[PDB]
Design a protein around this ligand. Structure first.
Ligand SMILES: N#C/C=C/c1ccc(-c2nc3cnc4[nH]ccc4c3n2C2CCCCC2)o1
Ligand SMILES: NC(=O)Nc1ccccc1
Length: 288
């Protein structure tokens, strides 16, 4: 099996990302032991009990089964005698995440390129949808840059498959400003709750992930004068009153319209990724 990587030939280099229960590390797979082997991204767990190990095994099986140009590529696993020694080996994308890329190259990325990224993310999300996978972490920081015109969805740590007989599932630290109100209120997740997140992703792209325009900064602006109202409680009120993130300056009207539709109160009033994609394509392809 070329998908089995020998733990002893994985040489640690640096950290790519960190969560509460895991890290993704840059490593070299160096079976010749002369430091010429290929670089890979390797996820492993820390501070993990059975639930986290169980979620990690699911993550491995999910990603291994996805074959899309817009989803980060599974390469294999590693293991050893060690208790927490199971690792997920993925492709390494050295241009990093889209959030950083947009902040760094803002000046040279026009609305046409942002449209292109939007279209690609949407297609990877359509691909997930057709496999009944709810991603749950869809944000610019979890999208990778393969090249200047090619992005890929990553961080499957929270991804979960829908049952064959329901179109949602329920769970028992969430990025609150990316989450659908039913997910924050009632822990209901669906492909339509990923549509909501995608709308915040649009927001990010067309603000170039600028920190002064971030969802959290806008929230603090909209918050009103009572600054000791717990964020989640006040966000739920604001969303229930019909308040939404404002249109960025870079935003064409049509993209702002799609954002607002992604943020329809009822999940069932939100467009599917299949309905969004052709609209983003009209705009993108029509902006070449
Ligand atoms: N804001 C912000 C910063 C985000 C950031 C910095 C570095 C990375 C990152 N580079 C990677 C390169 N090859 C990779 N293969 C699979 C995941 C992966 C890489 N990630 C992960 C993406 C999300 C999960 C953890 C880091 O993201
Ligand atoms: N989807 C959406 O509009 N979310 C939101 C609204 C107000 C402040 C922060 C985030």
């Amino acid at each position: 099996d070329p998908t089995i990587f020998e733990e002893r030939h994985l040489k640690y280099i640096s950290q790519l990302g960190k969560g509460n229960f895991g890290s993704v590390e840059l490593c070299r797979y160096d079976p010749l032991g002369d430091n010429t082997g290929a670089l890979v991204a390797v996820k492993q767990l820390q501070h993990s009990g059975p639930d986290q190990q169980r979620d990690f095994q699911r993550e491995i099986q999910i990603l291994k089964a996805l074959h899309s140009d817009f989803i980060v590529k599974y390469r294999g696993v590693s293991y050893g005698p060690g208790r927490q020694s199971l690792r997920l080996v993925m492709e390494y994308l050295p241009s990093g995440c889209l959030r950083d890329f947009l902040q760094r190259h803002r000046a040279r990325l026009d609305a046409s390129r942002l449209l292109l990224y939007s279209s690609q993310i949407c297609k990877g999300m359509e691909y997930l949808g057709s496999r009944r996978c709810v991603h749950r972490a869809l944000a610019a920081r979890n999208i990778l840059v393969e090249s200047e015109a090619h992005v890929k969805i990553a961080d499957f740590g929270l991804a979960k498959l829908l049952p064959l007989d329901k179109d949602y599932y329920v769970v028992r630290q969430s990025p609150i400003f990316w989450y659908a109100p039913e997910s924050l209120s009632d822990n209901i997740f669906s492909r339509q709750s990923d549509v909501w997140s995608f709308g915040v992703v649009l927001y990010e792209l067309f603000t170039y992930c600028d920190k002064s325009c971030s969802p959290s900064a806008e929230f603090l602006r909209m918050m009103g004068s009572e600054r000791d109202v717990p964020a989640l409680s006040r966000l739920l009120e604001l969303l229930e009153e019909g308040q939404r993130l404002p249109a960025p300056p870079a935003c064409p009207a049509e993209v702002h319209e799609l954002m607002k539709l992604c943020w329809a109160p009822s999940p069932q009033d939100r467009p599917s990724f299949s309905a969004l994609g052709p609209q983003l394509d009209m705009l993108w392809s029509g902006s070449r």
